[model samples]
Target: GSMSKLIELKQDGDLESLLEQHKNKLVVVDFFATWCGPCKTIAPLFKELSEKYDAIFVKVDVDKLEETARKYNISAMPTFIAIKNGEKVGDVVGASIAKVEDMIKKFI
Candidate 1:
């Protein structure tokens, strides 16, 4: 099996370092909250995508890491952001699996 895994972004320092550490790789960040219904529905799909692709999957709970979500300008729940070379290249707000997949494929 491949080594695709989801990393949780909990702190500002960790988020900052992750962006730098995975600069050469595709970084898919999910800004979500446990209370969000759509976020729950699309979570497993994101996990599956993580296992199928050669990119880093990260989940940031907006309730816990409000600052991180704020930094990324995530105004909606289940906002998916793709980063490369330490910059945000694209994003998908809401729980559209197709759009999320498209963003991943486009970036990765």
Candidate 2:
């Protein structure tokens, strides 16, 4: 009944658990805001890739969960953080789907 591939993180605890759950694997965290223009634009393709790629894709809405955003040093909307072994390996900020996908490609 659901086609969503994106894992929307509504709480900070979930983030920690998910990261730990996907440890030893590629985990991509999408830090964005709901009202942000570019964040909305790039979301669909991001979800598409969540289904296409082998990595775990996560969504952390800054407005919904500010602590998560703040802790991650999210200076901008639509920042994609790539994590491996529960640590950040790389990141792609802004709305470039290509860059985000490329980031995923490198990890996997």
Candidate 3:
């Protein structure tokens, strides 16, 4: 189904470009791990939001890019950070669909 809608940040460089590329719009950063149960449950919800909204969706693997997670001070999986112009506006920590959707609405 072309999950390509979700942008995966593989490393530091990728994140740099993403912040630059989507500087104009709200960038939704999905901080998750492969083994997190809650992260798995909300995967489709995040992806669906990516397709539904005009904002940018970025998926960051906390295990693979620990630095990124540390930068955002994310201590849990499925922490969604909303960014605009390289600055984090807010974040929704957890797998709650309502929280994530509510956060996105503020930006878009």
Candidate 4:
């Protein structure tokens, strides 16, 4: 499984390039907190899906990048936002494996 699908978007930087880099594929932006157990629970699943789909899943550490989280209005952990061409397509806010898969299937 390739870890390359998950890319970090640092705070104080533009997401345009990041979105552009993955423009050819569906983009899964995950907002997670280190203290959230449910968020951790979905990490491996996300990695698996990323590997399975290849170039569709990306993750952002909400704790480390508060500004980014604020930009997206992410007030909770374990939030998944599906995007394509810099436009939001779908989103999820939980640890349900089935829901995760469904969102991925819909967006990717």
- Candidate topping lDDT: 1
* Cand. 1 Cα-lDDT: 0.85
lDDT of 2 by residue, 1-108 (tens): 332247888877788887666687788888999789999889998998899887778899998888888888998889999988868999998999999989988987
Local distance difference test values of all predictions, in order: 0.85, 0.85, 0.84, 0.75
Error of 4 at 91 (Å): 0.2
Each model's total of backbone clashes: 0, 0, 0, 0
Best by TM-score: 1
lDDT of 4: 0.75
Predictions: Cα RMSD each? 1.8, 2.6, 2.7, 2.5
- Candidate 2 lDDT at 34 equals 79
Model 1 RMSD vs true structure: 1.8
The TM-scores of all predictions, comma-separated, are 0.92, 0.91, 0.90, 0.83
Estimate, for each residue in 9-81, the C-alpha lDDT of model 4 and write its tens digit: 6664545567766676778888888899998888888878777775556678887777778877887778888
Q: What TM-score would candidate 1 get against the native?
A: 0.92
Worst 10-residue lDDT window, candidate 1? 1-10
After superposition of all CA atoms, the RMSD between model 4 and the true structure is 2.5
